[PDB]
């Protein structure tokens, strides 16, 4: 089907004979020449160790919350660690996190019984998932949890339990029987990383290095995790100082601001159009003519 | 005053549905000939104009 335009016609028609006519066989598209990658020129390594390697976590009724911002996040350091009994992610894939880039990350941190790990998931029903700590049903993030019987057992009455992301401080407040003899009855530490995917300037981004920037040529691109393909160009689009992307009626990006120097780049899809094959019948000749629809002959 | 024709269109339904994603294009093949019979109907409309 890629031998010649008549063969693409035969395949389009699902036929070995072709009658006289003009047949729309395919869309011609210029493929990307090279792949651009573009992230903020920032180098601070993110403080995930200050959350994960902390001496004591909080109680689940009174859970900690650390904002992570303005830093480079090598999530491989967490994801490759043998320490974690579960690492389940929602709205993102763990493999994609180093390819990806967020406005902020919120690291929630607390201690639970090993039975209760199941309740730290999107929209769940249960005593943790209402009276203590709940994830949104549309949560985008990772839940990272492990047994801590070697650290948090003694039992250790200093760990206690009673809307999405809600704190609330007779009262049903009670303490865990965490003893080293306890497996579901052990203490477990959990960190929940929540990812903020607003269209504001990204500040927590993977270690994936930026390339040089290319213009007036068809490229694949990635700006702050916004992947695409097109002829990047300079533009007269008067972005106001707060604006970061531009959009068209299809709700697709048609301009971006470069995160390393704040110029406004137009995005246009690479040269493309319908291909129509003009043929006499194959009973007459195997010769064909090709119409590249709406393109100028200089583009072909 | 009488209408005689209307704007001839073609919609490349693989580009409309999947936007040059190959990951989506491979899923769209599992719907079979829905895309070729959409192009066949629009081409019949266009030749009729």
């Amino acid at each position: 089907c890629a031998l010649d335009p008549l063969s693409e016609t035969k395949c389009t028609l699902k036929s070995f004979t072709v009658e006289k006519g003009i047949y729309q066989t395919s869309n011609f598209r210029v493929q990307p020449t090279e792949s651009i990658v573009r992230f903020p020129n920032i180098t601070n390594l993110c403080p995930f160790g200050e959350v994960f390697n902390a001496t004591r976590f909080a109680s689940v009724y009174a859970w900690n919350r650390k904002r992570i911002s303005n830093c480079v996040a090598d999530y491989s350091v967490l994801y490759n660690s043998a320490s974690f009994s579960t690492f389940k992610c929602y709205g993102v894939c763990p493999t994609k996190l180093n390819d990806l880039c967020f406005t902020n990350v919120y690291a929630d941190s607390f201690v639970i019984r090993g039975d209760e790990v199941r309740q730290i998931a999107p929209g769940q029903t249960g005593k943790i998932a209402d009276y203590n700590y709940k994830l949104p049903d549309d949560f985008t993030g990772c839940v990272i949890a492990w047994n801590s019987n070697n650290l948090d057992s003694k039992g250790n009455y200093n760990y206690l339990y009673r809307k999405p992301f809600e704190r609330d401080i007779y009262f049903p407040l009670q303490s865990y029987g965490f003893q080293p003899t306890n497996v579901g009855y052990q203490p477990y530490r959990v960190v929940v990383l929540s990812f903020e995917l607003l269209h504001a300037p990204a500040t927590v981004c993977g270690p994936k290095k930026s390339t040089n920037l290319v213009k007036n040529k068809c490229v694949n691109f990635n700006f702050n995790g916004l992947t695409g393909t097109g002829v990047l160009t300079e533009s007269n689009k008067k972005f106001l100082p707060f604006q970061q992307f531009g959009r068209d009626i299809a709700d697709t990006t048609d301009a971006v601001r470069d995160p390393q120097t704040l110029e406004i780049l137009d995005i246009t899809p690479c040269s493309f159009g319908g291909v129509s094959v003009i043929t006499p019948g194959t009973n007459t000749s195997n010769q064909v003519a090709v119409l590249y629809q709406d393109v100028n002959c200089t583009e072909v | 005053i009488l209408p005689v024709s209307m704007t001839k269109t073609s919609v490349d339904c693989t580009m409309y549905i999947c936007g040059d994603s190959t990951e989506c294009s491979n899923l769209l093949l599992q719907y079979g000939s829905f895309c070729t019979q959409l192009n066949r109907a629009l081409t019949g409309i266009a030749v009729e104009q």
Partner: peptide, 22 residues
């Protein structure tokens, strides 16, 4: 003629007869 007046795979094809042929 004066009184009468989409990268997404949508396209408009020209008519066979131009206005000058009509």
């Amino acid at each position: 003629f004066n009184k009468v007046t989409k990268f997404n795979g949508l396209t408009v094809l020209p008519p066979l007869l131009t206005d000058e042929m009509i």
